[PDB]
Each structure stands twice: as C-alpha cells, then as structure tokens.
From a paper:
The overall structure is reminiscent of that of other TetR-family transcriptional repressors, and consists of an obligate homodimer. Each monomer is entirely helical and consists of a DNA-binding domain (DBD; composed of α helices 1–4), and a ligand-binding domain (LBD; consisting of α helices 5–13). The dimer interface is formed via interactions between the two LBDs and is formed mainly through hydrophobic packing interactions.
The structure of AvaR1 was determined to 2.4 Å resolution using crystallographic phases determined from anomalous diffraction data collected from SeMet-labeled protein crystals.
Author numbering:
A (entry chain B): 8 to 218
B (entry chain A): 7 to 218
Write the structure that this text describes.
C-alpha cells in the first residue's frame, strides 16, 4: 500500500503531463504504473480522484531546502529548484503533471479544485516575505500580499512561455531574470548585493534536495 | 454573406474552445453554437484543427490599436491594460479569450497547433516598443530588450492565469498594473516611472477610443 499509492500517483502525473486531464484514462495510468487493477482501485475510484490527489500533493512534493541566513535567498532558491524540477531532462513527475492540471483551464463541468495549489503557493510565498520583513530584508511599506500574488503569477507565466518556446530548457535563466527584475522594487539594497542568482548555487541546492 | 458566415463560425468556435478547450471540443458543439448548417461549416473549415488554427491566426488582428504616444512605456502599459479588459468577460472579445486559452493550454504532442507563432508575435511586438523606448532615453541605454520582452509576455500570461483561477479575471487590471509597477523601475530612466499613468480613467479613455 505504502509505495503503491505513490507509484500510481507518479504514473498518473506523467500521463496527465503528456495528454492532459480530458484525454487521459484510467487504462493509461494502469499501463504506465505497472500495478494490478486491484491495487489501483484500492486507492482511487476514478480519473477525477487521481487528478485531485495529484493537485493536492503539489506543494508537499517540492523539496524544502534548509533554512537560510536570508529569507529572500530562500525564496530565490525555491524558485530555481522548482525551475529545475520542471525541466524535463530530470523530471519530478508529480510537479510537472500537477502544474499542467493547474494551468490547463479545464471545464466548469469537472470538479478539480485548482485554487488549492495556487492558494498554497501564494500563502507560502507571503509567509517568507513576512519573515523577511521582520528580519529587515524588505523596504518599509512593501505590500507583501500583492507581492506574493505577483511572484506566483509571474513564475507561472514565465514557466508557460518557456515550455512553449523551449520545452523549459531556458527556464532557469528566465526565472533568474524575473527575480533580478522584481527584487529591487522591495528588497533592502544591502540584501540585493548579497543575493546569489548563480547556476552553481542552483546546482548545490538541487543536489542537496535530492538526497 | 460568406464573410459573415465564416466569422460567425469562428466566433462560435472561439467561445467553445474557451469553455472546454481544444481536446474536449467537437464539430457538433461549434455547429450548435454557430447556428449554421453542416454544409456551411465544412465549406469554410475541414476540421476542428483548422478551426482552432483560424482562431489563433486572428489573435493579433483582434487586439485593438492604441494610438502612438510620446512615452513608449505608456503605450506598452496601455496595451497590457486594454488586453486585461478584453480578457475580462462581458462584451469582452470571444476570439481573444479562446485564442489565449488555446495558446496557454498545453495540448497534445501530436496536435498541429503552432503555439509559438502568437507568443513570438507578442514578444516581437513588445520588444519593438522597448527598442523604441531605448532610443528615446526612456529605458537604460544597454537594456537587454529581448530578455525584457520575454519577461513581460511571460509574466503577463501567468498573472492572467492566476487571476482566472482565483477571481475569474475580476482583479486582472490591478494585478497587471502591479506587475508593470514592480518591473519597470529596474530598467526605466530616472524621470520616467513618475510620468507613467496606471489610472482606471486612462484605461477607460483608451478602451472607449478603441471600440469606435
């Protein structure tokens, strides 16, 4: 049961990533997972429940990197880690599939709650910014709620454009560009000098998070 | 008569694609919504694919023109807020909403929708305005204008997505203004940011002029 649920979920995420929710079927998930019909239907009744469980595990399946000196470096590290996990070279399969389900508009008919992962990303980002403000890293009257929405929104679209134009190959640089152009508007100048946008730190954070 | 019929079918297909997406859409749905005969549909379009490609091909031309301005960055801002209005539903443009959904929706690897083409056209259009702004001393003299255009097109797309999910695009004007207000200080020359107008009143004047 324990690894079996995960095996099914990973397979469903890969199927949803390739064809989307509507074109996917339970049969495809069975083939890809390589588990019995019994094991699948023990954990999930339907395609709907599968896709909802993929969405519900989006945030928890991001590896958190150890707490940092600078909260804004933590925010930067997470965004570049997420960019790496979305690159198809080395997939986290849950994240890619979950993101596709979230961004794909779907139908009013389907019962997929796409607010849940976005609300969770927004709230997580807002907390980091609130913690950064208490540690003297942000300008005095920064609208931290509006900033969180901006970052989550902007990241999503940079990731979408990057998928369309390069299959996410340039995503690290697009995300670094985004953060380099947004952070000056609210970060204390003395924090900006200290932030590390390098690919080398991107690697170190990624390698540590995998094991 | 045949020009109106083609357009009526296209508008209907755009609305259907907007509601259920490319994959879930069918020719039958487009027929019901358009209210034309099967003969009239297949005269103009062979398939669902050709319908969706024609929706994408009309994306750019269905953006209303904003007048040339003194401040090129104001022109860029005006366009983005106008696009935000056209994506908010009411009398808001069915071709644009459906085209945007087709562009952003990931689709299948086997479908023959070229989603690069409209994004490349948006990127190139934005890059031109920024190139003109750079020559007029509005933005830094060696600003990476290609990278900036990609950032703006990418960021706008995602702000629009997040806004759809959380509010059905109700807050989109403010989210877009926020984006522009927080991105522009990193590459605008000293005088410039204070001269930009993010007001809803200017948004109106631009929208009303564009409808006529």
């Amino acid at each position: 049961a324990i690894r079996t649920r995960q095996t099914i979920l990973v397979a469903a995420a890969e199927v949803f990533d390739e064809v989307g929710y509507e074109a996917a079927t339970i049969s495809d998930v069975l083939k890809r997972s390589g588990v019995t019909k019994g094991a699948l239907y023990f954990h999930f009744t339907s395609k709907q429940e599968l896709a909802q469980a993929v969405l519900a595990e989006q945030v928890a399946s991001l590896p958190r990197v150890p707490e940092q000196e600078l909260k804004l470096q933590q925010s930067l590290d997470e965004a570049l880690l997420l960019a790496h996990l979305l690159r198809e070279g080395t997939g986290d399969p849950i994240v890619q599939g979950s993101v596709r389900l979230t961004v794909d508009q779907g139908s009013p008919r389907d019962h997929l709650n796409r607010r849940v992962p976005m609300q969770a990303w927004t709230e997580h980002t807002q907390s980091l910014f609130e913690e950064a403000r208490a540690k003297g890293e942000i300008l005095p009257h920064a609208d931290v709620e509006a900033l969180a929405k901006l970052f989550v929104g902007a990241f999503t679209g940079v990731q979408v454009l990057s998928r369309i134009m390069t299959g996410r190959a340039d995503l690290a640089e697009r995300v670094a560009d985004l953060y380099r152009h947004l952070m000056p508007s609210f970060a204390m100048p003395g924090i900006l000098v200290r932030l590390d946008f390098s690919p080398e730190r991107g690697s170190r954070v990624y390698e540590a998070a995998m094991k």
